[PDB]
């Protein structure tokens, strides 16, 4: 049974082809689809898609949605694969977790468009794609399994090119020391409040975030004698004992 | 000082309630000695006619050797009703419910009227004893057959403690009057009269047999036939004195049966001879003194625990064999006399007997060692090891309580065929001091093994297997074809435990050269024949010695024992020892000059890369940075003698070819702040160091490689260098800042994101910080535990053939293999590779997780871990796995001095992998105790155990890589692997991806992609496990128990999806296995589902 | 069926991420009334749950606070409430706390926490206020939950000041007072006519308050404005098929007449 092709919560079953293994004669990689929203600049007119192909990157999604565009007259404005986490190495950001700035869903690649009419045209096209794959398994709409997976994951013993990472960390240090000296100068230049309140600061401290986090992390001589109520309590002591 | 006696009372409640099986059988032996009471006399009738009288009967007479021919048997062949006594085991209350069977002691000493003053010569009184036995068993068999209780009994002629001089009458019961649900073998024994002759014949310097080589064995045997009644008088009077004896000796017999020391005999070639009443005798002898001034060793003021401790202290600090032995007389102080009789000795002057002459010199030697070893593990106040000292029967296996084994098969043919089938002695003077053929070959073979090895082994034990003290009613003797002879042994166990520092030393040294060739050089040249000669040395000494051509597969201990066997005791017998060579080609043999002739205890490859590393060290210190080097420290597996290739130059194909070296600069407070910026500054320093390296010394070459063995830091590279001596080193910069950066990242992270960043910091600590003291400690200790690098290398190849290295880490495998070394109790340290490896697997099959931590201190023999740190380690273990209920995600707990947390290396491994390891260990020890060691046994121990658990892929890269990894493939020619050996560096360094394998890290990537659906494994030592061509690799996968069937579709299922219903989904297993092969499209060849 | 402790831990080993299994193991001790042992097992569970599943960590914290509300007392309720607000989202802890406090029938903490939490997360939302207003009308505090409009308008910014009178008019038409609810709705129809949702849902809430004469006046009084074709089809069908569910002849006439003008 393949005619079951759409789930309860708007999920659009998207099957594709698989290539030829030398011993395998089938070939059902399954994806989901939605159309979700939020007013921020990374979730408006967007789509989930679940159960990703390995190294789903920008270029074969480019060619696949171009194939659908030239196939069944859908319009599409693709730009980038938003929040592509397939391996699981970019959840917690250590650099933002302990930095001054450059601060701030499992196998669900998100993808948004420019035109909501374009993403609705691809939505209707994809629902018809799901049911045409359900009807026939041989006149498929297709993302063929094109492989830049090889181009990024059979060559990983490569020496990273020396001049490239030279200029890369050259630019990284050249912006890091700039924003660092800017932050420290902003710290110990002069801080008056809205009213008159000069802020106490260290001799060689570096960040308002630093003094903020240390003020977050920083969240006797009585006498048993000498008073006449204490001679009252000690006469009570010296008559009870 | 509190809970060991609670353990003692646990042993008491384990051993007790003997009444249900002492009362009924004391009633049954009461009926039995009533039957012996109504057995009447049988007067003097001649020997030559009782031959014919017993001829056509079923009772053919047993005999001591040889059969008494009537030319001199003019003895009084009487029979009288003897004296009954119910003594010993069931009268002094030392009965363990063993499923093998406790013994019994019923005494029938001979009456006064059937001997003479000079009856004690030429063992025809023992012939009298044997025919006495023959009539008693004939009379008893017809009486019990007319009393019709033969339906469950069977009588048998045995030997009293494996001695042919003393046969006994043992009764074994089988399936109202039957006793078969527990201990067997109720035996009766006759003895000699109490006091007959003045003690000159009782002295161990007697021989009245014909032409004086004395007979101390025989005048001890007849004296032990007679005078073991004063000793139980002594036992009973100390029993009436005080009470701790019964529990002290059930403890003693318990420990001695765990050590394999029963009181049969070690003169006949078996481990034993020492036993429970000997233990009683030495406790009560140390009662009234023990010192040289008879200072009281043992008071009953302290109970059995300190009685036992004082006993083991006296036996370990007071020699008996060669210098000093105990003296005591039962009729009465006890002291310590000064010399030794070259045999286990203690003198009892009221008997003139030598009670410890039932076992031999090597058996006493190994028992004094066991005294010292259990004393060492008993006197310590650190931990509690009562189950380590008692409750593990070490006697179960041969190669576990011993270190290696030889089996001499001697096909001598016949007793007459001796003179051309074996080169040993054949004399009156040897048959007068040795009972039989196995006895003289046993004493000769232990003396020639002792003289052949000397300072080459710790201890030798000889044990003839196929021996049995069992011969039937109808038969006169053990009438048994014992595989090429008719003597009571099949073949000779030669079990060796070795001083491991002189196994593969290829020259043993006799005395030097005087002109007058004295007797020591004489007996050296006689014992060594044509082979040994006198040589010069670099010192210039002229000394007697012999060359031992060391091979890899063969330890030279087997060659020297092969010559010491085939030169002296036989000239055509053969030696069986195939286990050592059976795994030594399972070791990988590197492409080194004369590497077959190199030992396995040679470390010249590791020293070669250490020399290359040191010249690199000098050329990286003699240059100028903007921030100087504080220290570099190698941390590599080769720098701690662990890597599976014994590291040959240019050997790229091993994935741990690149050793890793941490390097740290001085504490400059100028550093970048955030973590990506600081690791990029470390890359900047590595850019500068390789820039000046290629500037000045271009004979080294280098490149950069990203590392992702720490999670979530995207910009951490390592500097890899290729050294023109032919090696490859990773360099990782450490700073003083990364530790506090990770700690404050931990502090300011979101509170539901804490333990993952804690896991990142734990991986950092394991990779950078504690790894240095790890490799320092065990590299320092490997030169004291010399078999460590071979046992870890064979363990790691076993673990990759059984496919676990994709989850477990190599330091954890290293810690599991150091565990039997730094704590080998109750055993020895392993002087051989097999003993090490099966000690590892026996321990980890024993080992649990729920109530079992693993504390070890990697210390030198004889800085340790004290009580406070021990309790802190156990307490954080305790709260750790009461927070963790059963080991849901934390399985092992390996805690050292260098990591009292213990969770550093055990983290990350899945529960199926850990349970698979423990199950494989239990399967291996099951196979060991069932099938025995064999070539197919070892091949089954290195079978893949592929199990067809859901997934098999078969992978072959387009080239073979064993000539490139440098392990030679046992070829007939070395130029065949030399012209394919990669003794050149590749110029464009990108080609190492196709000169190596991608399988381990691609299985890593796929595992972290499918972390909650299926766990994957790949053979990461490619043709080390993959046959001979060097190409076969597998990919396997165990599916989770969650995905047994279709599940309700969600967004957090996060798996490979197939809606088989509108609500239910399952894997597209063919599509994802196809995508695995699609990623490995050039790597994959074959695939099998299920 | 789950009976023994090894069976329970076998369920949790073979199933790590189903709150069905997790609250089965919790509800076993809840039903055996060894609920302090369930408290220490809960301290096991919150730190042995996988941390990726936000909904399931909501499940385990909701279940722990369900324990502390069903049998606990306020001095530990505030403790686990503070720990829940620290670990996970304070606002959803507040909403589940308010629902569960009125389920366990404790006004003496419920009204005070309604006040404090509508103060807290009511300057960026509306539901923490309107749950309080609906609760007060359900427990007979009509004018008290009508006086909440000034509190809502000074708590929130300008952006959903339409939405506060929207929602309080929702609950006033639910079970408050209809003509006083229209006296709230007059600010909606005076502020914004060009939001076409408010008119339609206001006459639909007029239908569900069912004052039929003013239904027959309100539908007949919308139509004189600038009505586009989708809005015409909406209002037209919601009158005509409702009359399907004295006037029907005139709106059958207006089915054709207002096609022209």
Swiss-Prot record, chain A:
Component of the 90S pre-ribosomal particle. This is Ribosomal RNA-processing protein 7. Belongs to the RRP7 family. It comes from the Eukaryota. The lineage of its organism: Eukaryota, Fungi, Dikarya, Ascomycota, Saccharomycotina. Present with 2610 molecules/cell in log phase SD medium. Pfam families: RRM_Rrp7, RRP7. Keywords: Nucleus, Ribosome biogenesis, rRNA processing. One of its GO terms (molecular function) is rRNA binding.
Curated annotation (Swiss-Prot), chain B:
This is U3 small nucleolar RNA-associated protein 22. Signal peptide: none annotated. Belongs to the NRAP family. Present with 3260 molecules/cell in log phase SD medium. Involved in nucleolar processing of pre-18S ribosomal RNA and ribosome assembly. It comes from Saccharomyces cerevisiae (strain ATCC 204508 / S288c). GO terms for cellular component: 90S preribosome; CURI complex; nucleolus; nucleoplasm; nucleus; small-subunit processome; UTP-C complex. Transmembrane segments: none annotated. One of its GO terms (biological process) is maturation of SSU-rRNA.
UniProtKB/Swiss-Prot annotation, chain C:
Present with 8860 molecules/cell in log phase SD medium. Interacts with snoRNA U3. Interacts with MPP10. Component of the ribosomal small subunit (SSU) processome composed of at least 40 protein subunits and snoRNA U3. Involved in the biogenesis of rRNA. Required for the formation of 18S and 5.8S rRNA. It is found in: Nucleus, Nucleolus. It comes from Saccharomyces cerevisiae (strain ATCC 204508 / S288c). This is rRNA biogenesis protein RRP5. HAT repeats lie at residues 1-31, 105-138, 176-208, 210-245.
């Amino acid at each position: 049974i393949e005619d079951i092709s759409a789930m309860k919560n708007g999920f659009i079953v998207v099957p594709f082809k698989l290539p030829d293994h030398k011993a395998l004669p089938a070939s059902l990689h399954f994806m989901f689809a939605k159309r979700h929203q939020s007013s921020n600049s990374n979730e408006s007119d967007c789509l989930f898609l679940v159960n990703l192909p390995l190294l789903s990157n920008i270029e074969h999604m480019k060619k696949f949605v171009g194939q659908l565009c030239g196939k069944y007259d859908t319009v599409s404005h693709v730009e980038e694969l938003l929040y592509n986490d397939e391996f699981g190495l970019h959840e917690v950001d250590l650099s933002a977790l302990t930095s001054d700035l450059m601060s701030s869903p499992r196998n669900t690649a998100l993808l948004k468009f420019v035109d909501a009419a374009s993403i609705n045209n691809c939505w209707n096209a994809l629902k018809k794609y799901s049911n045409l794959h359900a009807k026939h398994p041989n006149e498929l709409f297709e993302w063929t399994y094109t492989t830049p997976s090889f181009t990024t994951f059979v060559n990983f013993y490569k020496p990273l090119d020396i001049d490239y990472l030279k200029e890369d960390i050259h630019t990284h240090m050249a912006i890091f020391e700039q924003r660092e000296a800017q932050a420290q100068e902003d710290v110990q230049s002069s801080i008056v409040d809205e009213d008159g309140f000069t802020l106490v600061v260290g001799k060689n401290t570096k960040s308002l975030n630093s003094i903020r986090k240390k003020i977050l992390n920083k969240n006797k001589k009585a006498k048993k004698d000498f008073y006449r109520f204490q001679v009252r309590e000690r006469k009570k002591q010296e008559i009870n004992q | 000082s509190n809970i060991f006696k609670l353990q003692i009372d646990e042993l008491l409640e384990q051993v007790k309630l003997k009444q249900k099986h002492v009362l009924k059988v004391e009633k049954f032996l009461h009926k039995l000695y009533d039957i012996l009471q109504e057995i009447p006399d049988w007067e003097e009738k001649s020997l030559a006619e009782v031959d014919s009288f017993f001829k056509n009967k079923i009772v053919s007479v047993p005999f001591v050797d040889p059969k008494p021919i009537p030319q001199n048997t003019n003895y009084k062949f009487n029979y009288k009703k003897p004296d009954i006594s119910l003594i010993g085991s069931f009268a002094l209350k030392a009965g363990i419910y063993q499923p093998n069977g406790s013994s019994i002691d019923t005494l029938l000493t001979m009456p006064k009227e059937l001997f003479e003053k000079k009856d004690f010569l030429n063992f025809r009184c023992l012939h009298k004893r044997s025919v006495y036995l023959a009539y008693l068993t004939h009379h008893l068999l017809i009486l019990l057959k007319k009393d019709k209780l033969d339906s469950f009994l069977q009588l048998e002629y045995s030997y009293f403690d494996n001695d042919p001089l003393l046969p006994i009458l043992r009764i074994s019961c089988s399936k109202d009057y039957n006793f078969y649900k527990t201990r067997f073998s109720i035996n009766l024994l006759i003895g000699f009269p109490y006091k007959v002759f003045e003690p000159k014949k009782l002295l161990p310097n007697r021989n009245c047999i014909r032409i004086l080589p004395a007979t101390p064995l025989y005048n001890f045997s007849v004296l032990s036939s007679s005078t073991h009644e004063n000793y139980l008088k002594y036992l009973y009077k100390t029993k009436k004195q005080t009470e701790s004896f019964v529990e002290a000796t059930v403890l003693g017999r318990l420990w001695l049966q765990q050590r394999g020391f029963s009181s049969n005999m070690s003169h006949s070639g078996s481990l034993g001879g020492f036993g429970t009443f000997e233990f009683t005798i030495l406790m009560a002898a140390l009662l009234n003194g023990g010192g040289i001034n008879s200072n009281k060793i043992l008071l009953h003021g302290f109970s059995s625990y300190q009685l036992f401790k004082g006993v083991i202290k006296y036996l370990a600090t007071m020699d008996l064999c060669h210098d000093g032995h105990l003296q005591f007389h039962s009729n009465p102080a006890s002291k310590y006399i000064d010399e030794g009789f070259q045999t286990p000795t203690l003198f009892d002057k009221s008997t003139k007997v030598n009670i410890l002459t039932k076992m031999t010199v090597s058996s006493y030697q190994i028992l004094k060692e066991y005294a010292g070893e259990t004393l060492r593990m008993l006197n310590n106040v650190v931990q509690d090891q009562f189950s380590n000292i008692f409750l593990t029967n070490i006697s179960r296996f041969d190669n576990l309580k011993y270190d290696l084994c030889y089996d001499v098969q001697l096909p001598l043919g016949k007793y007459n065929n001796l003179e051309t089938s074996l080169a040993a002695t054949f004399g009156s003077m040897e048959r007068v001091k040795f009972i039989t053929l196995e006895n003289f070959l046993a004493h000769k073979i232990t003396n020639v093994a002792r003289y052949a090895l000397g300072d080459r082994i710790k201890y030798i034990q000889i044990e003839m297997v196929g021996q049995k003290s069992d011969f039937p009613i109808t038969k006169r003797k053990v009438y048994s074809n014992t595989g090429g002879n008719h003597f009571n042994f099949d073949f000779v166990r030669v079990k060796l435990i070795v001083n491991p520092s002189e196994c593969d030393k290829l020259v043993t040294k006799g005395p030097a050269h005087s002109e007058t060739m004295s007797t020591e050089a004489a007996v050296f040249k006689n014992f060594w024949g044509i082979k040994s000669s006198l040589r010069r040395f670099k010192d210039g000494s002229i000394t007697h010695c012999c060359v031992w051509s060391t091979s890899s597969s063969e330890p030279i201990i087997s060659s020297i024992v092969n010559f010491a066997l085939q030169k002296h005791v036989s000239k055509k017998a053969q030696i069986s020892n195939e286990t050592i060579k059976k795994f030594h080609n399972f070791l990988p043999l590197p492409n080194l000059p004369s590497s077959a002739k190199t030992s396995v205890l040679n470390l010249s490859s590791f020293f070669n890369l250490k020399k290359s590393f040191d010249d690199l060290y000098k050329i990286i210190f003699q240059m100028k940075l903007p921030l100087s080097v504080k220290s570099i420290l190698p941390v590599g597996s080769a720098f701690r003698y662990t890597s599976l290739c014994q590291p040959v130059p240019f050997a790229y194909s091993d994935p741990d070819f690149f050793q890793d070296v941490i390097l740290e600069f001085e504490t400059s407070p100028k550093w970048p702040d955030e973590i990506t910026s600081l690791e990029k500054a470390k890359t900047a320093f590595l850019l500068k160091i390789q820039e000046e390296l290629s500037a000045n010394s271009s004979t080294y070459r280098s490149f950069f490689s990203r590392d992702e063995s720490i999670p979530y830091n995207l910009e951490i590279v390592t500097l890899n260098i290729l050294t023109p001596e032919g090696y490859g080193f990773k360099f990782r910069v450490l700073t003083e800042r990364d530790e506090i950066l990770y700690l404050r990242a931990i502090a300011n992270a979101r509170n539901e994101l804490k333990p993952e960043l804690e896991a990142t910091f734990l991986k950092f600590t394991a990779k950078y910080l504690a790894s240095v003291r790890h490799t320092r400690t065990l590299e320092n200790i490997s030169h004291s535990y010399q078999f460590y690098s071979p046992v870890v290398r064979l363990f790691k190849r076993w673990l990759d053939t059984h496919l676990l290295l994709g989850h477990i880490t190599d330091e954890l495998a290293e810690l599991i293999a150091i565990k039997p070394f730094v704590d080998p109790a109750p055993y020895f340290i392993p002087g051989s590779l097999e003993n090490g490896f099966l000690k590892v697997l026996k321990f980890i099959s024993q080992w649990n997780w729920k109530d079992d931590p693993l504390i070890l201190d990697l210390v030198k023999p004889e800085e340790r871990l004290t009580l406070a740190q021990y309790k802190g380690i156990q307490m954080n273990f305790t709260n750790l796995r009461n927070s963790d209920p059963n080991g849901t995600h934390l399985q092992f707990f390996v805690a050292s001095k260098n990591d009292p947390s213990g969770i550093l290396y055990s983290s990350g491994i899945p529960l199926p992998i850990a349970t698979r390891l423990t199950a494989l260990a239990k399967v291996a020890v099951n196979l060991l105790q069932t099938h025995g060691l064999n070539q197919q046994t070892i091949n089954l121990l290195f079978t893949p155990g592929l199990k067809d658990y859901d997934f098999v892929v078969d992978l072959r890269t387009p080239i073979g890589l064993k000539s490139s990894c440098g392990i030679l493939s046992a070829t007939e020619f070395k130029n065949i692997t030399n012209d394919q050996a990669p003794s050149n560096f590749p110029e464009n360094l990108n080609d190492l991806s196709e000169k190596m394998d991608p399988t381990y890290q691609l299985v890593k990537y796929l595992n972290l992609k499918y972390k909650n659906s299926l766990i994957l494994s790949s053979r990461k030592y490619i043709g080390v496990n993959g046959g001979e061509k060097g190409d076969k690799n597998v990919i396997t996968g165990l599916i989770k128990p969650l995905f047994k069937g279709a599940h309700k579709f969600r967004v957090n299922l996060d798996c490979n999806v197939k809606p088989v219903d509108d609500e239910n989904v399952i894997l597209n297993k063919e599509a994802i296995f196809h995508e695995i092969a699609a990623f490995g499209n050039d790597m994959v060849i074959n695939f099998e589902t299920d | 069926a789950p009976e023994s402790v090894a069976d329970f831990e076998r369920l949790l080993i073979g199933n790590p991420n189903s709150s069905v299994v997790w609250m089965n193991y919790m509800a076993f001790q809840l039903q055996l009334s060894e609920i302090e042992k369930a408290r220490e097992l809960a301290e096991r569970a919150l730190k042995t749950i996988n941390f990726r599943e936000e909904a399931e960590k909501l499940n385990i914290w909701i279940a722990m606070l369900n324990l502390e509300n069903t049998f606990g007392t306020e001095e530990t309720l505030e403790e686990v409430f503070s720990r829940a607000c620290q670990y996970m989202d304070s606002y959803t802890i507040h909403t589940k706390l308010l629902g569960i406090y009125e389920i366990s029938e404790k006004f003496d903490k419920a009204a005070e926490l309604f006040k404090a939490t509508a103060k807290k997360f009511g300057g960026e939302k509306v539901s923490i206020w309107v749950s309080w207003g609906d609760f007060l009308i359900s427990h007979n505090e009509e004018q008290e939950a009508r006086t909440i409009l000034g509190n809502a308008l000074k708590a929130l910014p300008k952006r959903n000041h339409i939405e506060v009178v929207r929602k309080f008019a929702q609950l006033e038409f639910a079970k408050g007072d209809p003509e006083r609810g229209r006296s709230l709705f007059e600010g909606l129809v005076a502020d914004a006519p060009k939001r076409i949702d408010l008119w339609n849902v206001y006459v639909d809430q007029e239908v569900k308050a069912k004052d039929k004469k003013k239904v027959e006046d309100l539908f007949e009084r919308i139509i004189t404005k600038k009505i586009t074709r989708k809005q015409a089809k909406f209002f037209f069908n919601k009158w005509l098929q409702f009359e399907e569910s004295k006037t029907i002849e005139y709106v059958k006439a207006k089915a054709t007449e207002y096609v022209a003008s």
